[PDB]
Amino acid sequence: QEISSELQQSEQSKQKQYGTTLQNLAKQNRIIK
Amino acid sequence: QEISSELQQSEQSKQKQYGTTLQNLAKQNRIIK
Amino acid sequence: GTTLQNLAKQNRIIK
Amino acid sequence: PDNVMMHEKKDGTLMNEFTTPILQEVMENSKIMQLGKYEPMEGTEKKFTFWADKPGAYWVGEGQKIETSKATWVNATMRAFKLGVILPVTKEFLNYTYSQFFEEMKPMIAEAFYKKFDEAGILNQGNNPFGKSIAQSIEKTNKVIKGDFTQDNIIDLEALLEDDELEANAFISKTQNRSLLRKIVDPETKERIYDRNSDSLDGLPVVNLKSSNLKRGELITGDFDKLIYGIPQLIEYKIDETAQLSTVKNEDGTPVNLFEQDMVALRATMHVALHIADDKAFAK
Amino acid sequence: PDNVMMHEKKDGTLMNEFTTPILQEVMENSKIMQLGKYEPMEGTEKKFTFWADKPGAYWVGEGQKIETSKATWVNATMRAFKLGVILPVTKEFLNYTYSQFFEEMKPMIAEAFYKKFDEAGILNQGNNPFGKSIAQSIEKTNKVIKGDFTQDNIIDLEALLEDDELEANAFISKTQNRSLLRKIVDPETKERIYDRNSDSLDGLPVVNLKSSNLKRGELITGDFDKLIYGIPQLIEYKIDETAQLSTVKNEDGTPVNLFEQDMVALRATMHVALHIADDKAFAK
Amino acid sequence: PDNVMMHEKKDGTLMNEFTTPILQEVMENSKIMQLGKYEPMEGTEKKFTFWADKPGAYWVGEGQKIETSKATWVNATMRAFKLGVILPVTKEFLNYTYSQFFEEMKPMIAEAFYKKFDEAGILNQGNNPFGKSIAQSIEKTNKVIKGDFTQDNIIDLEALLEDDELEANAFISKTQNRSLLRKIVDPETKERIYDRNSDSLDGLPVVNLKSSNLKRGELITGDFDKLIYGIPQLIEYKIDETAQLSTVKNEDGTPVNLFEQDMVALRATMHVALHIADDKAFAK
C-alpha cells in the first residue's frame, strides 16, 4: 500500500534523471569544448 | 584521554594536508612555474 | 641516491 | 512492455531505449547543435541570468547591478513523406516488428527534421520562429561588416564581438563561400589560414552550413543555449496531406494515392544572447 | 554528518570534500591567481616575503637579499541571487540531495567570486579595497607612459621596471584592446610581435581579467600574494536584499517576489608589490 | 633511528628517505641539470679521458695516446628564512611532524637553490664560481657569430662545433628570444623551422633561461656533469646575522624580533668540455 506507491515513484524518477545523462553524452559529440 | 589525543593529532593533520595539495594544484594550473 | 640516478635521466629531455 | 513481438500499432510514443539512437543522428548532423550547450527543463521554463558583485560587510560609493527572468516554449513539427511514399502497407512492417521499424526510420525522418531547425535557428527564413534568431539579434545590435574578403575579415569579425568581453569560438560559413577562403594566404608571413586537413580557420572550430539562403556570409558565436524535451511521439493514418503537394497540381487524395503516412513532432526550443558578429557582401 | 542523504536545510556549511572542487574552479576563471603565489594562513599569520640569495661557503655574501614583514585579513561575500531565484523551492532540491546541489552550483557561484576579486584586486574601481591595489602602487612609484603602441615602447616598459629589482613576468591587457596588437608591423624589422595562435606579447604570456574599466592597459607584476582559505559557508534566506536590484526600479520584496537566496561568505586576501608598470591613452 | 612522531631537533641532518624527494624535483626546475648528467662519487673525484687502442701484433703504432686527470669539488651553503619564519607556529609544524616539515620546504628552498645554480653554471655573474664553464669557454675559444636570424646561421652555429667532432645536441634560448624565432622561413623549402606547439628549434629541445642577461642568446652544448652528493642538512639558530638587512638601513636583530633562520649545506659539481657556441646581436 505505502511501500508500493513509494517504490514505483522512485523507479520512475531515476529513469527521468537518466534522461539527463543522454544529454551529457551529446555534449561529448559537440565540437566546441 | 592519551589514546584519544593521538587520534586528534592524526585527524587535524590529514585535514590540513588537503589544503596544501590545493596550492600544489594551483601551481600546476598557472602559466609560470 | 640510487633511485635519483635513474629518475634524473628520465626527467631530462636529452637522451 | 513491448520490444519485438509485432507492429500494427498506428500510435507509437517512443521508448527511451529507441529515443537515444534516433536523437543522436538528428543532433550530430545539425550545425546549431554543435555550437550550443544544453540543459534539461520542461515545456515551460524559468531560468535566470546575469552576474553579481558584493563586498564582505562594507559600504562606500555605489555598485550597480541587475537580474533578468527568461523562459522557453513551443515545438517544431514536420512529416516524413520520403518515408511514407516508400512504404506500402503495415502488414509488411508487422513482420519486421516494432524494433526494426524505428531503426529503419533512423536515416529517414532524422535528416529532414534537423534541416528545418537550422533554417529557423541561425537564419530567420522558415515559418517556425519563437525566441528571435542569431540573424535577428544582429539586426537589433549592429555587428555589420562591409563586403570584403582578405585577412582583414578575421580582424574585423572578432573585434566587433571583442568589445563586449566575449571571446571568439565558432565559425559558421557555407560550402559555396568555403571555396573562396582556400585561396587566401598571408601577405608578409608565409602560411595559409583555412585548411581541410586541419579543420580550422584561425585555429578555431569551423562548421559548414548547407542552407539555400545565404550567399557569401560569415558568423562567429560562443555562448548559446538549446533545449530538447519530451518524446518524438508517432501517429500514422491515411486521410489527407495538406502541406505536401503531389508534383504537378493536386495535393493528395490519400484513399486514391494509397500511401502509409506518419506524423512526427519533437519539443525543441532555443535561447539566445544578444551579442554576435556577422559579415556579408556589398558590391553596390 | 552530511553525506548524500537529503537537503531541506537552510544552512549548509561545506565539508572539505565538496569545498576543494569549487575552489579549484575559481582558479581557471581567475587571472590574479596566475600572477601570484598562494602561501596560506588561518585568520591572520605574520609570515614573511621576498626571495633568498646564497652567500656561498668560499666568499662572503656582500650583496643584500632583504626580508619584509606582512599580515593581512579580509572576507569576500557574494549572494547568489540568480542561483537562489533559479531554485523554485528547497523541497525540489531535496530530490537532488546535498551532494548534487553543489555540483549544479559549481560553475556558477565561482563565476561571481572571481569577477569581484579580480576587479578590486588589480584596479581600484570596485568598492571593496583593503591593502592598496596595483593601480594605487603605480601612483606611488611612477612607471607610467604616454599612450603609444610600438615595438620600442614595449621594450622600454620592461626596461623601466627592470631598473628596480626584478624583470617582467607577464602582461595584463584587455580582451577589447587586441586590435592594436595585430597592426604593429615595423618597417626595419618586418615582423609581428604579438602571437595569434598562442597568447604572448613579446614572449611573456598574456591573460585578461575581463573587467569593464580599462581601455589601453598594460600591467606587469610577477611578485604577488593571493590567499584562499576556510569554507565558503552556505546560508539560505528569504526576507530582504538591499545590495541587489530587481527588474528595473524596486530593490527586492522577498515575501511578495517568492524566491530563495544563497548567501555565501568566502574568505580571500591579497597583497601588492611596490614597482608595477602601466600605460594609458590621453591625446587631449 | 629517527621516527615521524615529533619535532624538536635543531641539527636536522636529512636521512636518505627524505634526501631524495627534495633533490628529485629541484632538477625539473634547473636548466643546467637537464643539459648535463648525473652520477655518484666518493666525495671528491678525478676523471680520466682519451682512447688507448692497438691491434694484436701486426705492427706497432707510430702515434701514442695521452692519459690525463680532471677533478671536481666545492660546496654551496645557504641560510633561508622560509620555515624558521614560521617559528610562531612551529608547534603546529610539530603536529605536521618532521616528515611534513620538509615537504612544505620542497617547493621553497629548492626554488631558491636552482636560480642561484643556473647563474653560476651558464652565466658568470653571481659570486659562487668554481667550474668556470660556459661563460669562460666563449672567451677562450671564440665561437661568437654576428646577430642574424636565418637557417644558414643555425647551420653555421652547428658547423663550428661540428668541426671538432662534437654533435649538436640541444639549444638554450630564453622566452624573449622565442618571438624572434617566428620569422625564420627559407625561400626554396617554405616551412616552419621553430614549431609553435612543439618546443624545438631545429628538431632539438629548447630551454628557457629566466635570468635576465642574454637578450637574444642561442647556446649549444649538451655535455655536462652536475651532481649533488651527501646530505643537504639543516641547522636552526637565533643569532645576529652580519650578512643581512632588516627594513631599509638596519640589521636583523634576531634576539628581539622572534625570527629564525634555516641553514642548508648543499653540494655542487661542474665539468667543462670546451666546445660551445653563442650568438647575440649585430650592433644594438
**DSSP letter at F37?**
B
Count interface pairs E-F at CB distance under 8 A: 88
Closest residue of D to A23, CA-based?
A: D38
Cα E189 to Cα B14, E2, E248, F80: the distances in Å are 58, 65, 55, 45
- Distance from the Cα of F136 to chain E's closest Cα (Å) equals 20
Residue that the C-alpha cell 555540483 belongs to: E103
**DSSP letter at F122?**
T
Closest CA to D113 of D76, D148, D86: D76
- Among C3, C11, C14, whose Cβ lies nearest the Cβ of F27? C11
Closest CA to E50 of E62, E35, E66, E37: E66
Directed axis angle between helix C2-11 and helix F16-29, to 10°?
A: 20
Q: F120 contacts in E (CB within 8 Å)?
A: none
Chain F neighbours among C 1-15 (CB < 8 Å)?
1, 3-5, 7-9, 11-14
**CA D201, D204, D208 angle in degrees (round to 5)?**
65
Longest dimension (CA), chain A: 50
Q: F38 contacts in C (CB within 8 Å)?
A: 4-5, 8-9
Closest residue of C to F15, CA-based?
A: C1
Cα B33 to Cα A15, D47, E249: the distances in Å are 46, 40, 48
Q: Does the beta-carbon distance from D207 to A22 stay under 8 Å?
A: no
Q: D60 contacts in E (CB within 8 Å)?
A: 127
State how far the Cα of F111 lies from the Cα of F28, in Å rounded to an integer: 11
**CA F6, F8, F9 angle in degrees (round to 5)?**
115
Q: A30 contacts in D (CB within 8 Å)?
A: 33-34, 37
Closest residue of E to D69, CA-based?
A: E247
The torsion angles phi and psi of F75, rounded to 5 degrees, stand at: -120, 180
Q: Is-contact D180 D143, C-beta < 8 A?
A: no
Count interface pairs C-F at CB distance under 8 A: 39
Q: What sign for the dihedral angle of Cα E217, E210, E80, E42?
A: negative
Q: Partners of E240 in the beta sheet?
A: E253
3-state secondary structure at position F170:
coil
For the CA atoms of chain D, what is the radius of gyration? 24
**CA D60, D61, D63 angle in degrees (round to 5)?**
105
The resolution of the experimental structure, rounded to one decimal in Å, is 3.7
Q: Does the beta-carbon distance from F177 to E203 stay under 8 Å?
A: yes
DSSP states along D3-47: SSS----S-B---HHHHHHHHHHHHHH-HHHHH-EE----SS--E
Q: F149 contacts in D (CB within 8 Å)?
A: none
Q: Which of D186, D190, D200 to mutate to test the interface with F (most CBs of F within 10 A)?
A: D190
Longest dimension (CA), chain F: 83
Q: Partners of F235 in the beta sheet?
A: F263
The rounded Cα F44 to chain-centroid distance in angstroms is: 19
The rounded Cα F70 to chain-centroid distance in angstroms is: 20
Q: Is D92 exposed, middle or buried (0-12, 13-18, 19+ CB in 10 A)?
A: exposed
Chains D and E physically touch (3 or more Cβ atom pairs below 8 Å): yes
Q: Does the beta-carbon distance from E20 to B18 stay under 8 Å?
A: yes
Q: Is-contact D237 D261, C-beta < 8 A?
A: yes
Closest CA to D233 of D52, D67, D76: D76
3-state secondary structure at position A15:
helix
Chain C neighbours among F 202-231 (CB < 8 Å)?
205, 207, 222, 228
Q: What sign for the dihedral angle of Cα D221, D224, D229, D235?
A: negative
Q: Which of F38, F206, F224 to mutate to test the interface with C (most CBs of C within 10 A)?
A: F38
Residues listed for chain C: 15
Neighbouring C-beta atoms of residue D146, cutoff 10 Å: 11
Amino acid of residue E199: D
**CA F60, F65, F70 angle in degrees (round to 5)?**
160
Q: Does the beta-carbon distance from F95 to B9 stay under 8 Å?
A: yes
- Distance from the Cα of C7 to chain F's closest Cα (Å) equals 7
State how far the Cα of E36 lies from the Cα of F14, in Å rounded to an integer: 31
CA atoms in the 13 A half-sphere facing the CB of F267: 18
Q: What does the CA dihedral E88, E90, E93, E94 come to, rounded to 10 degrees?
A: -150
State how far the Cα of E69 lies from the Cα of F252, in Å rounded to an integer: 12
3-state secondary structure at position E46:
coil
Neighbouring C-beta atoms of residue E120, cutoff 10 Å: 22
Q: Partners of E146 in the beta sheet?
A: E280
Q: Is F125 exposed, middle or buried (0-12, 13-18, 19+ CB in 10 A)?
A: exposed
Neighbouring C-beta atoms of residue E55, cutoff 10 Å: 22
Closest CA to F232 of F20, F72, F42: F20
Residue that the C-alpha cell 546575469 belongs to: D50
DSSP states along chain D: --SSS----S-B---HHHHHHHHHHHHHH-HHHHH-EE----SS--EE-------SS---S-----B-EE-----EE---STTGGG---HHHHHHHHHHHHHHHSTTTTHHHHHHHHHHTTTSS-SS--SS--HHHHHHHTT----S--STHHHHHHHHHHHTTT------B--HHHHHHHHS-B-SSS--BS-BTTTTBSSSS--B----TT-SS-B------EEEEES---BEEESS--SS---TTS----TTTS---EEE-EEEEEEE--S----B-----
Q: Is-contact D113 D77, C-beta < 8 A?
A: no
Cα D86 to Cα D89, D108, D258, F133: the distances in Å are 10, 10, 11, 84
3-state secondary structure at position F226:
coil
Closest CA to E26 of E103, E105, E104, E111: E111
Closest CA to D120 of D131, D107, D110, D129: D129
DSSP states along C1-15: -HHHHHHHHHHSS--
Q: Does the beta-carbon distance from A19 to D40 stay under 8 Å?
A: yes
Q: What does the block give as the cell for D112? A: 529532414
Closest CA to D84 of D111, D109, D107, D110: D109
Q: Is-contact E191 E202, C-beta < 8 A?
A: no
Neighbouring residues of F244: CB distance < 8 A, sequence distance ≥ 6: E64, E65, F251, F252
Q: Is-contact D83 D109, C-beta < 8 A?
A: yes
Q: Partners of E8 in the beta sheet?
A: none
- The 3-state secondary structure of E132-188 reads CCHHHHHHHCCCEEECCCCHHHHHHHHHHHHCCCCCCCCEECCCCCCHHHHHCECCC
Count interface pairs B-E at CB distance under 8 A: 36
- Among F86, F128, F175, whose Cβ lies nearest the Cβ of E203? F175
3-state secondary structure at position E99:
helix
Neighbouring C-beta atoms of residue F99, cutoff 10 Å: 15
Neighbouring residues of E114: CB distance < 8 A, sequence distance ≥ 6: E26, E29, E30
Interface partners of chain A (CB pairs < 8 Å, 3 or more) are D
State how far the Cα of E120 lies from the Cα of E130, in Å rounded to an integer: 9
Neighbouring residues of F185: CB distance < 8 A, sequence distance ≥ 6: D189, D190, F191, F192, F193
* E184 shares contact with chain B (CB less than 8 Å): no
Phi-psi region of F173 (alpha: psi -120 to 50; beta: other; left: phi over 0): beta
State how far the Cα of E65 lies from the Cα of E55, in Å rounded to an integer: 10
Neighbouring C-beta atoms of residue D125, cutoff 10 Å: 15
Q: D20 contacts in A (CB within 8 Å)?
A: 22
Neighbouring residues of E157: CB distance < 8 A, sequence distance ≥ 6: E143, E145, E168, E218, E220, E277, E279
* D74 shares contact with chain A (CB less than 8 Å): no
Q: Is-contact E101 E93, C-beta < 8 A?
A: yes
Q: Does the beta-carbon distance from C1 to F20 stay under 8 Å?
A: yes
Q: Is-contact E119 E210, C-beta < 8 A?
A: no
Residues listed for chain D: 284
Domains of chain E (ranges; CATH) run 11-44+71-280 (3.90.1690)
State how far the Cα of D121 lies from the Cα of D115, in Å rounded to an integer: 10
Q: Which element (helix H / strand E) includes A17?
A: helix A2-17
Q: Is F236 exposed, middle or buried (0-12, 13-18, 19+ CB in 10 A)?
A: middle
